[PDB]
Amino acid sequence: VKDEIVISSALRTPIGAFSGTLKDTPAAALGAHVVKTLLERTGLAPERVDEVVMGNVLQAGNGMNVARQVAVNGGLPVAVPAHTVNRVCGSGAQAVVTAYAQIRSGLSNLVIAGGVENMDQAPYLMPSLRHGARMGHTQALDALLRDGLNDAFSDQHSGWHTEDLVAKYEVSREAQDRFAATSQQRFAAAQAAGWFEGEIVPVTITTRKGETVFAKDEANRPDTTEAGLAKLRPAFRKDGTITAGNAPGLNAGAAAMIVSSHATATELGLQPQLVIRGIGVAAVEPGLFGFGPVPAIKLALAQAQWQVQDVDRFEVNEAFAAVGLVVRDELGIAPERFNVDGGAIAHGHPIGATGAILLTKVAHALRRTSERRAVVSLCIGGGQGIALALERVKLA
Amino acid sequence: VKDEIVISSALRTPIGAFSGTLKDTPAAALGAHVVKTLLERTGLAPERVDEVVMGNVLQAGNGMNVARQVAVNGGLPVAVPAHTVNRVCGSGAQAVVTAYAQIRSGLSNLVIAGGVENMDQAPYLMPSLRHGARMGHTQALDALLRDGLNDAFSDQHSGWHTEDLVAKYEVSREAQDRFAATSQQRFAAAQAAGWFEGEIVPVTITTRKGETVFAKDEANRPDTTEAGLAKLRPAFRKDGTITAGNAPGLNAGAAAMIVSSHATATELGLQPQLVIRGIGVAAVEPGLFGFGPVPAIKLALAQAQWQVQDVDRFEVNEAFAAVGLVVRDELGIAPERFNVDGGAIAHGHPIGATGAILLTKVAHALRRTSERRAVVSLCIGGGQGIALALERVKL
Amino acid sequence: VKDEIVISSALRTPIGAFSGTLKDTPAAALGAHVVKTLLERTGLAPERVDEVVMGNVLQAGNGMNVARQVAVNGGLPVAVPAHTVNRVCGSGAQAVVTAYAQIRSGLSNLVIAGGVENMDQAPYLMPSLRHGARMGHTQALDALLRDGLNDAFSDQHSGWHTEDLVAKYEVSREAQDRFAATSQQRFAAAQAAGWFEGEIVPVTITTRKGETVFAKDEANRPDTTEAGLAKLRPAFRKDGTITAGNAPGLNAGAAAMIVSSHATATELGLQPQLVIRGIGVAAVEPGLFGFGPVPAIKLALAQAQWQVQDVDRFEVNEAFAAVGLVVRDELGIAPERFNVDGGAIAHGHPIGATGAILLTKVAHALRRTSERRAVVSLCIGGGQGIALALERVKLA
Amino acid sequence: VKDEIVISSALRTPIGAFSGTLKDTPAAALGAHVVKTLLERTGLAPERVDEVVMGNVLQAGNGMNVARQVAVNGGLPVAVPAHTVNRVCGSGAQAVVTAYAQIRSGLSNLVIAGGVENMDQAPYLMPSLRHGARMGHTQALDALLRDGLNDAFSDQHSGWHTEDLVAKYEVSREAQDRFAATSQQRFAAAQAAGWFEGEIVPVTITTRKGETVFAKDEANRPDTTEAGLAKLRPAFRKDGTITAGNAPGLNAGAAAMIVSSHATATELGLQPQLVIRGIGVAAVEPGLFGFGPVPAIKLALAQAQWQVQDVDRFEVNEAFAAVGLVVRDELGIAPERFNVDGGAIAHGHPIGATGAILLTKVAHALRRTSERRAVVSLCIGGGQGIALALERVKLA
Ligand SMILES: */C=C\C#CC#C/C=C/C[C@@H](O)[C@H](O)CCCCC(=O)O
Ligand SMILES: */C=C\C#CC#C/C=C/C[C@@H](O)[C@H](O)CCCCC(=O)O
Ligand SMILES: */C=C\C#CC#C/C=C/C[C@@H](O)[C@H](O)CCCCC(=O)O
Ligand SMILES: */C=C\C#CC#C/C=C/C[C@@H](O)[C@H](O)CCCCC(=O)O
């Protein structure tokens, strides 16, 4: 058990809205700020960090190796190596899985793992500029669609594919809007109660006329109602059910945490928040966007030797309200135990950071509630799912 | 021995030149072709593949998750998960290290790992197109520079930084050109002897006029001489030493291999080529581009409990001739044991595939020569190094 | 006197600000709207229009032959030919000079002449996209700079060259700012008195949420003060004097008028506004941006057999406050007779339309004041000037 | 005879192929070279040049006022004014008409008129780059299509519209290919006989390894046969008749000449080549691309008091073989008098220069053959036509 792998000091920036407060702040700078703050608050000797692993999906234009920028600009010694992982919308949780594997295999003793993303900062791409278009009009591609949200096999948006999940599982528009309004209401009430203050580190943004201290999530809509959501038009198919109100936005943020054995965390005076009891990574047909969390959660629960009913809360990414409903109802999870404090429809989905954001949220929620067992899971894009089974570590 | 981690069936495409035969073939398609060929030749049951891990540096414009495209278009079942790693010029070796860690930690039993890159296919980037340039001229950035070759902290080319390595270690232009000419001569003789045929899988490219069967490396320059290299102008600093002739090109290629325990490989009827005996990952100041292999090799050798003199061959990426000379000389390696069959100055440096290409090269060279111990190492970009200590597995 | 060449029915749109009300309305559409309104108000038989000539500088992206689009989309019969002229910032006056030449040479009897511009609608240019950039970063050029405001020989902005005019004529910063503040004051007072209502035709702009009727100039800055202008930084040279406050903006608009002999105008029931008594086109060194009006005015006055002191008002384009001061003081024009109702620093400089706008302003101002003699003149860019000497025609 | 308007010293570059020898040489540099050579060969006193007028269609990216660049870099004194005209594919002939109107109206006494174009050098346009694309892919437009070859009302290529002319006049594919093969054969034989050497001025192109002297037209295909043309696929409509072999290419070149009264040319020691006896400019429905030369020719002939049978040769631009056939057969012109030495299918169509190239060709051909009367005409784009009726002037 001393060899159990634990997460300590999980922290996140607030999440920016599209064209919002973080629109001019690169993803790697958001990560560097979290890492700098984590080092400050823990007092961890920076030389005890063996590697930095960061998730980031839209690497275009972010410069050589985002994770190395996070590490060096986060103030770690230049001797700390770093690399960037991409499992699309699961990347921030993949970074933690990568850290687990490096610790259990003996390659590292302590890793800073997390993820970063800023969708406004994703550039446009000009595939014909290197060797020429020659004659005739040519296209400039939005990288957030080409590398992040469109399926690589069909070139259709993930939301377009999710309409086929909607049809297969008969998920009504009204159920999606009810779930979305509930996510907004749960999130706003938790935010108002101060429940996210412990996990959020403020970022100071410098502008022309001055400075903004960005300290609280800004992308949520607390006035959302089922009635207002029913006014909206479908976003991905003319006859569809998915709208801008029952899907997350295009967001920016970062989160990071310390991954180590429990023995190492105790030795260094850290306070572990969660032990990783199981990991699942699964894949399905790419067109079946949204279902991957079901087999991945089953794998993670098998490794943990837990059943669904043993779990106090599930935190499953709300890539679309439809995905949350399908996963919840396929696994038979109680609605009061699913995305308890709201999810990405409210707070935003900064794709390569969201898995780390969900781990951070669970670390702090279990501390507050004294719940013992949680599962974090995300659909990937391209037909994959990732899940972690997590248990609270008591305060020593 | 059961749980030693081994590499089996390492294979690679030939390496394309800049603006060359592979210029219209995406990196993910190159990887898919190697993986399809690997599955066909080994007869490995596709359901035994637990994950595909691919290195790729210039992910811009390649579509969602290059590794998943490699896996699915390589013909693996959609149930095989996949993810893409980026440790810059070490990414293809990082994929193998990631596979090692997944197997030793129990997350996987068998992984297909490798790397892919196509520098011609890297797009240009327009940072001001989303929200507008408003007024005044604006820049379109070459992604291969912004995301691959320029340092992220200084925005200078890696070759500009390597001039400071050259100055610190007093690496003469004459020695850089001697090393580059030797790499071309060694590679040309090995290619003519057929020494790369076993590791290469041909790729058929469909063009306007018909089909080209691309079957052998095309980027080397057998016309290279030291006298010719001495005439070239410096590429990165006015009074510099690094030129287009003592640096590799901007290349395309892919390589992949099976990583598993030795017991799993024997059970499934594979023929292991190499056992991973040590892994080193190190970092230094970003400005000291090129030195990273020295500490990384020392880490890998310490894990293997080998000394430099025990190693039959070192395969260290020739990111510039100057880097090869510094690493060789600082570790005291004999020149006949350093990049024995030539290196990237001759064959090319498709950045995210090169580490997997070098592992492939060593797997086949140790089989041919019966040498026992090798080290593969690459500098990263950004001040890092990766190294693996590798031992031949008998037939 | 029957064969004298006259201007009738001069009209203009209001002038839009940069990123303002006309930002989505192409220059050719602005011209079409003026031409359609001119035809409706005059009742001119459309078959009597022999040609349409329009000035336009930033032709990039406007589609084949802007003048033909203005004519056809303005409702003229397809049998009316049309062509587009470019003498940079003098293009809208050049269109009238071209019309004069076609009528006096017998090629035409009646021409609709004017100019159009919309600086927001100027695209960016990618010179390397056709045949490729190959390797290394490449530039996307702002067409308004490449084709409109930068000198073609030096690639420096016209405002950079004007700093040498400032140094040659010892034009103080304080005098430039006084001239700019006075232009704003004169314009704001004339606008409030209703003096621009007769020349302006409103344009209705359709948007997502509805419609805007754009009916009055929007680019002026009536709360400009000399003290506020003194705080601004130089725009073109570190140690310069020209700023954003003593130069016009980047504007959009159109203007058009009928040009014919006097006999033809009377025959067709038009009411001539001005007779063209002299035309001057001159050129000087490109680096001497701003001086061209001086020799051009002298040529136009020589043709008209007038002296400077015979002229009731000069309307000289305020490309920069410094140009207005140099031209006024070199010719010895009384300040109360120079840009009497304000100029482009206040109302805007939609480059290819401005010459037609100034002719329109003078036609209406002389009608209102009963002044007899005026001169319109503009510097061009590239070291040229254009001028017309104009006399009021009494009502029939 | 005194005040008749004459053309002297007409000269042209050779015409470059698309992606050919002139691909790196701006249009304005081609014109400056012709003007410099014209001044050197005639010995004309540069102070006697009153204006430079140049046609140019694809002005995007060519810098401020192409005609002023031609004049200044051609070595004329900076005191010579200049402006650029755009009547699409008739621009180079429009520059001569503009010069005629300025001389007859008394604005000028001697003008250098011509046209320039380089289609390789036309840039791509990015309409969304100024104010952003926000989200989603966006288009980069080829300026040669947007501003030169596509109709401004339909956005279809001029060749697509010409398929309707083909259908209206029942112009068979076999006839189009016969006309195109004959144009190639006539051009190749005339070129081999040396008949274009007198009008061409060589251009020296500086390249990597050294210098190329470009001295002869390169875009023609002397091996063209009717049987080879029959194999080609239609270029503009799937069921079409127009192919890359019965249409011109995308070419580069320049041409210029001196325009003055006959008395002025004699006074200055020039040798007039042609007198302008009639000018016609006509317009028709835009969709009837290609028919415009018919009414324009009729107007020019009426001005000259000539009929078709009085004309020794017609030089009508081969915008497509179909256009040449329709114009020839509607006017009843003898086939051996229509495009006698070949036309643009063979030599190329550098759009803004072609009208000036055709005038140059006729000036030299009439001198060689002692023919007396010729007509030059071009379709415009957008449903217009321009024509000039021209008579040889004897040597003094
Ligand atoms: C791994 C994968 C995934 C995914 C996803 C998703 C979310 C899509 C929402 C996005 O399309 C949203 O509707 C955009 C609204 C932007 C509106 C604006 O321009 O402000
Ligand atoms: C991880 C890092 C790295 C690195 C490196 C490198 C190689 C650079 C060589 C490249 O600059 C080469 O000189 C380009 C020549 C291209 C010439 C052409 O346009 O054909
Ligand atoms: C023929 C020639 C000319 C000319 C001229 C001019 C005016 C230049 C003013 C322009 O540079 C102005 O300062 C631009 C301000 C725009 C600020 C914004 O982004 O809103
Ligand atoms: C004013 C008007 C007009 C016109 C016109 C025209 C000519 C079009 C020929 C062009 O479309 C040709 O097909 C282009 C071939 C280029 C092929 C290549 O890429 O090399």
Author numbering:
A (entry chain D), C (entry chain C), D (entry chain B): 2 to 397
B (entry chain A): 2 to 396
What does the paper behind this entry write?
By integrating comparative genomics, transcriptomics, functional genetics, and metabolomics analysis, we identified a unique polyyne resistance gene, masL (encoding acetyl-CoA acetyltransferase), in the biosynthesis gene cluster of antifungal polyynes (massilin A 1, massilin B 2, collimonin C 3, and collimonin D 4) of Massilia sp. YMA4. Crystallographic analysis indicated that bacterial polyynes serve as covalent inhibitors of acetyl-CoA acetyltransferase. The monomer of MasL shares the general fold architecture reported in the type II biosynthetic thiolase family. MasL consists of three domains: an N-terminal α/β domain (N-domain, residues 1–121 and 251–271), a loop domain (L-domain, residues 122–250), and a C-terminal α/β domain (C-domain, residues 272–394).
To investigate how bacterial polyynes target acetyl-CoA acetyltransferase, we solved the crystal structures of MasL in its apo and two holo (bound collimonin C 1 and collimonin D 2) forms at 1.78 Å, 1.66 Å, and 1.40 Å resolution, respectively. The asymmetric unit (space group P1 for apo MasL and MasL-collimonin D complex; P21 for MasL-collimonin C complex) of both structures contains a tetramer of the protein, as observed in solution. Although we did not obtain a good X-ray diffraction result surrounding the reactive Cys90 in the MasL-collimonin D complex, the nucleophilic addition mechanism of polyynes to the acetyl-CoA acetyltransferase was confirmed by mass spectrometry analysis. The observation of collimonin C/D (+C16H18O4)–derived adducts of enzyme reactive cysteine residue provided convincing evidence of protein irreversible S-alkylation via nucleophilic addition to the conjugated terminal alkyne. In the further comparative analysis of the polar interactions in the activation pocket of MasL in MasL-collimonin C and MasL-collimonin D complex, the C(7)OH moiety of collimonin C/D 1, 2, His158 of MasL, and a water molecule formed a strong polar interaction network, including a direct hydrogen bond (3.00–3.16 Å) and a water-mediated hydrogen bond between C(7)OH and His158. Furthermore, although there was no significant induced-fit within the pocket, the collimonin C/D 1, 2 caused the Arg135 on the tetramerization loop to swap and form a hydrogen bond interaction and salt bridge, respectively, across the two subunits within the binding site. These polar interacting residues for the collimonin C/D 1, 2 (inhibitor) binding were similar to CoA (product) in other thiolase models. The C6 chiral center of collimonin C/D 1, 2 is critical to forming different polar interactions. In contrast, the C(6)OH of collimonin D 2 did not form a polar interaction network at the contrasting face and showed fixed spatial direction (dihedral angle to C(7)OH from 32.9˚ to 42.6˚).
